[PDB]
Design a protein around this ligand. Structure first.
Ligand code: CHL
Ligand code: CLA
Ligand code: CLA
Ligand code: CLA
Ligand code: CLA
Ligand code: CLA
Ligand code: CLA
Ligand code: CLA
Ligand code: LUT
Ligand code: LUT
Lengths: 212, 202, 229, 223
């Protein structure tokens, strides 16, 4: 009934269609256990959301680098920010570890004990750190505009859109990494080269991706 | 069943204790797949030489078939719209889609007419049979509306196919040995049938 | 009931209850009621500041020319110090804003004057105070609210048009309209920039650099300057 | 009742309800009826714009046989009043007015019978008896029976679609207009053939317009 990643094969028994982006794609059966599938759903959403945020950063800084604004390219951006500002590297990395470890550990122990971060132990906050579903923490802070508690079918549509855009941005970031590792250029410079010569400037002419 | 002339000296269509890819359903189906690809191969390896000898296509084209870019040691052709690897990746994606949906109809009969494929689902319902799907595109004109006419057309497809398979093995053999094209071999054997044979080119 | 698209259907949470309700919510940002109260208040406040802003820019360019409204904060002069003006604005706006926000979060709890206990503001709705805020009303509120939200949406669009036209042309709104009347075919946003898959061209920014005020050196960037046509 | 080929059985959803129905759908694209309605509207749009384009290229080449419609789009090749015009402002006019009329017809497709009335002047209305056939001020002479005229309309339109993509194809191959190419084939039919002129695109390779360079496109790798 529902479209499978590979038409003709039936989907596996542990992938039913209740999840967003459920195409029955598990050929290595990594999520047969429901707890492992729950944990992988939340890991997929976290990787996807970081990839969407990262890919938007790549694209906007590369637009601002091709148009003459003086923005670095993303493989030089961290070095030029640390060196042009008054920033020491390891202190900013440790402050990142502090803030991300706090938030991340709240996420970890809300996976473990599902309603437990809404006890009020963090400063006074109650039901604003309670989750709605697995990996969907919508209260007043994380869903301030409040789309998950009105028009539930439209919210299911947004869950589908979020999972699809996240998978697309994960393969796009793997893109940017591979594109840079092959060509040694900015990715929107690579896009400009492909728009210049489509038939002749590509991965079959980089001399790396197919070494024959 | 099409082309059943009883010729099986090595007994490979035995239904008793079969399996794997040696099977009547796999062997007859791969027989018609090799037959159709070899008909296209025979026509495609003839056509530039005869159309350049007839004066219809120019002399920048009409090259020998092994100098097309199949074997760049044998010679390549600059004048395509891209490099042959740029061509070959499009071939990978396109033939992957085609051959892979064909494989899925072989493994699950009729399963290629449910999941959305741009409205192209009634075209790929197939039949209760591999190797002969039909439908509004694989049978454009309703040819073989009679069952006996359908058997006759399947048998003609089998015979023209086996002839083209022998012909394509011929094109490979002649191309390796005498180093020329098959229409050039026609010209030499029709010029001197005595002094231009396999026995001369050794 | 007129719509943003005549013939379509409005979303199920939009009925026609609020003024200016024409069924326009494609993202579904008002399906929560508690959110929709906050966004109605924010729409009214953005609309009123934008109407007063467009009135200020128009009357400023009419009355006092050779003063560019994007640079009035630079080229203004006063014996009133900049930090003194900013401190007065800070405390007085913090006062007024917190009074209005308390009326939002607790409906009708700051009606009474704190200094003069005689004067109390009458019961009302949120966003529409009344009383001494509205001494004179022409006609009925059922149409004036619609007029207010329509003029306010049009003036919000007008203010972002003023900002973009000032950053792209470098002139005021009346001077830019005189430019578009002097060359309508040749002075449009289509006529200044285009992106083609070959090459792309953006207009030069007419706001130069970090502005040198009295030692602060205010950085002045243009809005989304890499994404203009 | 005749079909597109002898011996071919028409599909079950093709019956004779729509005009120009020869039972021809080898890809099964109209198997879903909502998609069939969308492709009927797209067929009508392509047919009417192609009839307009063929009548265009025909009359333009007849009246002014020095235009060369394939290069008529340049700013220099414009008529008497505005012949160095700003193509930005021209595209601005076209974008606004076409976006208007197009969204009106799109809402006609989405809600049939909902954009018949004039929104400004409330005493005006077009009765559309079928989708894609507005009538009223769009049918000022009013010959609408309607069915045989719809068949004539879709047959002329399919012939004009084939004829206009023919026009573009010949004009890219031999570099001339349709009447000039017909005169060349009447001059010699053996020379100046499709057997000879093909393989070379006369496409002038990224014409620089006033500020920008458009990338140019031939339908086959001729060069
Ligand atoms: C929708 C109908 C329509 C069709 C079939 C064409 C077709 C054409 N236009 Mg035209 N145009 C059309 C609408 C318009 N054109 C123009 C303004 C131009 C200009 C300025 C130019 C053309 C050019 C061309 C040629 C295409 C060469 C090319 O680069 O294409 C393949 C590539 C892409 C489409 C990208 C061909 C004659 C070019 C030309 O005449 O030189 C060959 C050219 O320089 N057109 C405007 C005003 C904005 C149009 C309105 O919609
Ligand atoms: C762009 C695609 C996209 C979509 C469709 C969603 C959709 C959703 N998010 Mg997700 N989210 C995203 C990106 C997206 N998100 C990213 C990149 C992050 C990391 C920052 C998150 C982090 C996140 C959290 C922490 C939470 C959600 C939640 C939700 C759900 C309800 C909130 C909502 O409806 O916003 C709809 C989203 C949009 C309309 C996208 C706006 C597009 C922007 C404006 C593009 C421009 C941004 C760019 C920087 C410039 C809904 C399923 C909440 C939830 O699950 O509640 C139960 C929740 O708590 N998301
Ligand atoms: C070396 C030991 C060995 C032996 C004794 C067998 C024996 C068998 N295999 Mg197994 N098999 C082997 C290795 C072996 N195989 C390997 C290495 C693979 C992985 C490729 C397989 C994968 C495999 C499959 C998928 C199948 C079999 C099947 C069979 C059975 C029938 C095959 C037959 O006669 O068809 C005749 C053989 C052919 C038609 C193919 C010959 C041509 C291919 C390309 C092999 C060429 C071999 C040659 C040495 C290569 C020269 C290269 C040089 C010119 C450059 C028979 C029991 C079939 C079966 O189970 O049916 C009951 C079956 O479907 N085998
Ligand atoms: C200033 C911000 C602002 C806010 C908070 C609102 C809020 C509202 N609008 Mg209003 N609207 C605005 C500006 C705003 N509007 C402007 C400028 C126009 C003219 C284009 C309109 C035209 C309009 C119509 C026709 C209707 C509404 C309606 C509504 C209400 C329900 C829709 C909703 O839930 O979305 C909440 C909206 C927001 C949360 C603001 C969006 C914030 C996103 C993240 C920014 C995206 C904007 C994007 C950058 C474009 C900027 C402008 C662009 C031209 C450059 C809600 C009270 C409906 C109504 O009144 O029914 C009761 C209705 O029918 N609005
Ligand atoms: C104060 C120093 C400063 C300077 C000189 C610049 C300069 C620039 N910015 Mg950046 N920006 C800054 C701070 C600064 N920015 C900060 C703090 C943020 C986070 C809010 C941004 C968010 C931002 C975005 C999303 C984008 C830019 C872009 C740009 C470039 C084009 C101009 C523009 O779009 O306006 C700036 C854009 C804004 C939205 C205005 C915010 C900037 C003000 C000054 C922030 C002040 C807040 C601070 C706490 C006080 C230009 C080089 C564009 C670009 O080309 O990137 C590749 C672009 O897309 N900026
Ligand atoms: C507001 C500035 C602006 C202007 C005036 C244009 C104008 C144009 N664009 Mg561009 N476009 C723009 C922004 C703009 N674009 C941006 C910001 C992007 C990136 C999203 C694009 C992405 C884009 C593509 C992919 C294409 C165009 C094309 C065109 C041409 C369309 C002609 C046509 O189709 O008529 C009818 C026209 C010159 C097309 C073109 O070049 O054809 C000649 C074309 O293929 N544009
Ligand atoms: C010759 C091809 C042709 C034919 C047979 C039709 C037939 C029809 N059209 Mg269609 N139409 C056409 C071309 C054609 N049209 C083109 C090119 C366009 C785009 C401008 C349209 C746009 C259009 C609209 C908007 C409408 C119609 C409608 C109709 C129907 C009734 C109107 C009528 O009686 O005109 C009969 C047609 C002719 C007698 C052909 C005239 C030949 C001209 C004069 C040649 C001009 C010379 C040339 C410029 C050089 C009838 C089915 C209407 C309808 O269906 O209402 C219910 C309606 O509203 N047509
Ligand atoms: C049917 C298979 C077929 C294929 C794959 C090719 C392939 C080619 N032709 Mg050839 N050609 C063919 C049949 C074919 N031709 C026929 C039937 C004729 C007589 C009309 C020609 C007459 C011809 C000429 C005069 C030229 C080519 C050229 C070419 C090359 C560049 C493409 C081009 O611009 O030509 C245009 C495309 C076609 C002619 C094919 C369209 C018609 C077929 C039947 C569609 C299938 C390319 C290798 C060019 C070349 O050799 O460059 C140096 C060239 O100048 N062809
Ligand atoms: C499902 C399944 C199932 C079965 O069972 C098996 C198998 C098949 C194995 C599987 C599959 C898998 C896969 C495919 C995976 C992939 C992944 C990825 C790619 C990710 C990424 C992911 C990605 C990500 C996160 C990313 C992110 C990013 C980021 C943050 C960025 C950042 C940045 C920026 C902005 C800029 C600057 O200047 C720099 C940096 C710093 C650099
Ligand atoms: C019957 C029997 C029985 C018993 O039981 C046992 C035994 C004896 C074993 C058996 C036998 C068998 C046999 C004989 C077989 C043979 C086969 C063949 C020859 C094939 C080929 C086969 C072949 C084939 C497919 C082929 C194909 C081909 C092709 C596509 C080609 C293509 C092409 C062309 C166009 C042109 C250009 O230039 C390129 C190319 C690329 C070159």
């Amino acid at each position: 009934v529902r479209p499978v990643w590979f038409p003709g094969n039936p989907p596996p028994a542990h992938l039913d269609g209740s999840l967003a982006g459920d195409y029955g794609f598990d050929p290595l059966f990594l999520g047969q256990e429901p707890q492992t599938l729950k944990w992988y759903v939340q890991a997929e959403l976290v990787h996807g959301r970081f990839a969407m945020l990262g890919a938007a950063g790549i694209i906007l800084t590369s637009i601002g680098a091709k148009v003459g604004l003086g923005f670095p390219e993303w493989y030089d951006a961290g070095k030029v920010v640390v060196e042009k500002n008054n920033i020491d590297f390891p202190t900013l990395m440790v402050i990142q570890f502090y803030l991300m470890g706090w938030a991340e550990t709240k996420r970890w122990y809300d996976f473990k004990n599902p309603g437990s971060q809404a006890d009020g132990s963090f400063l006074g906050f109650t039901e604003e750190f309670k989750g709605l579903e697995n990996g969907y923490p919508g209260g007043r802070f994380f869903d301030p505009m409040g789309l998950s508690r009105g028009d539930a079918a439209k919210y299911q549509e947004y869950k589908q859109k979020e999972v699809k855009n996240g998978r697309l941005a994960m393969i796009a970031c793997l893109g940017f990494a591979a594109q840079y590792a092959a060509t040694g250029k900015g990715p929107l410079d690579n896009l400009a080269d492909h728009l210049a010569d489509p038939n002749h400037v590509n991965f079959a002419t980089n001399g790396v991706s197919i070494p024959i | 069943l099409p082309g059943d002339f009883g010729f099986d000296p090595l007994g490979l269509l035995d239904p008793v204790n079969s399996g794997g890819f040696i099977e009547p359903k796999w062997l007859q189906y791969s027989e018609v797949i090799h037959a159709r690809w070899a008909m296209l191969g025979a026509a495609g390896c003839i056509a530039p030489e005869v159309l350049g000898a007839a004066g219809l296509i120019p002399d920048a084209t009409n090259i020998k078939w092994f100098e097309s870019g199949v074997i760049p040691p044998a010679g390549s052709y600059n004048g395509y719209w891209a490099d042959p690897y740029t061509i070959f990746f499009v071939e990978i994606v396109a033939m992957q889609f085609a051959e892979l949906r064909r494989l899925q109809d072989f493994r699950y009969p009729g399963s290629m007419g449910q999941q959305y494929f741009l409205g192209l689902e009634a075209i790929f319902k197939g039949s209760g049979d591999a190797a002969y799907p039909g439908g509004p595109f694989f049978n454009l004109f309703n040819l073989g509306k009679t069952e006996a006419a359908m058997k006759e057309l399947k048998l003609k497809e089998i015979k023209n196919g086996r002839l083209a398979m022998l012909a394509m093995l011929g094109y490979g053999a002649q191309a390796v040995m005498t180093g020329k094209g098959p229409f050039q071999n026609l010209v030499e054997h029709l010029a001197d049938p005595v002094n231009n044979n396999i026995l001369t080119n050794f | 009931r007129p719509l943003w698209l005549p013939g379509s259907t409005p979303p199920a949470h939009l009925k026609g209850d609020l003024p200016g309700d024409f069924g326009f919510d494609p993202l579904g940002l008002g399906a929560n009621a508690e959110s929709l109260k906050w966004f109605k208040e924010s729409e009214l406040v953005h609309s009123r500041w934008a109407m007063a802003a467009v009135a200020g820019i128009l009357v400023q360019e009419i009355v006092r020319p050779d003063v560019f409204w994007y640079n009035a904060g630079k080229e203004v002069e006063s014996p009133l110090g900049p930090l003194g003006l900013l401190a007065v604005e800070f405390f007085l706006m913090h006062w007024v804003e917190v009074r209005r926000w308390q009326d939002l979060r607790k409906p009708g709890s700051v009606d009474q004057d704190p200094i003069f206990s005689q004067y109390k503001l009458p019961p009302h709705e949120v966003g529409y105070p009344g009383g001494v805020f509205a001494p004179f009303i022409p006609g009925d509120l059922a149409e004036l609210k619609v007029k207010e939200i329509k003029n306010g949406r049009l003036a919000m669009l007008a203010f972002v048009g003023f900002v973009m036209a000032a950053q792209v042309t470098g002139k005021g709104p009346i001077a830019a309209l005189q430019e578009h009347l002097a060359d309508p075919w040749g002075t449009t946003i289509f006529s200044k920039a285009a992106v083609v898959p070959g090459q792309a061209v953006a207009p030069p920014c007419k706001i130069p650099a970090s502005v040198s005020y009295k030692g602060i050196e205010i950085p002045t960037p243009c809005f989304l300057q890499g994404l203009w046509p | 009742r005749k079909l597109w080929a002898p011996g071919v059985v028409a599909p079950e959803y093709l019956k004779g309800d729509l005009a120009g129905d020869y039972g021809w759908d080898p890809l099964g694209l109209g198997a879903d009826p909502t998609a069939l309605k969308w492709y009927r509207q797209s067929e009508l749009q392509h047919a009417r714009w192609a009839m307009l384009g063929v009548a265009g290229v025909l009359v333009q080449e007849i009246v002014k046989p020095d235009v060369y419609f394939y290069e008529a789009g340049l700013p220099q090749n414009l008529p008497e009043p505005f012949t160095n015009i700003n193509m930005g402002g021209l595209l601005a006019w076209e974008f606004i007015l076409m976006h208007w009329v197009e969204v009106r017809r799109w809402q006609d497709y989405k809600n049939f019978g909902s954009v018949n009335e004039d929104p400004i002047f409330k005493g005006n209305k077009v009765p559309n008896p079928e989708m894609g056939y507005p009538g009223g001020i769009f049918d000022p002479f009013g010959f609408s029976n309607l069915k045989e005229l719809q068949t004539k309309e879709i047959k002329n339109g399919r012939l004009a679609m084939i004829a206009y993509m023919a026009f573009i194809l010949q004009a890219q191959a031999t570099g001339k207009g349709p009447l000039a190419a017909l005169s060349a084939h009447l001059s010699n039919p053996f020379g100046n053939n499709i057997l000879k002129n093909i393989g070379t695109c006369t496409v002038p390779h990224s014409v620089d317009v006033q500020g920008l360079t458009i990338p140019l496109t031939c339908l086959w790798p001729g060069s």
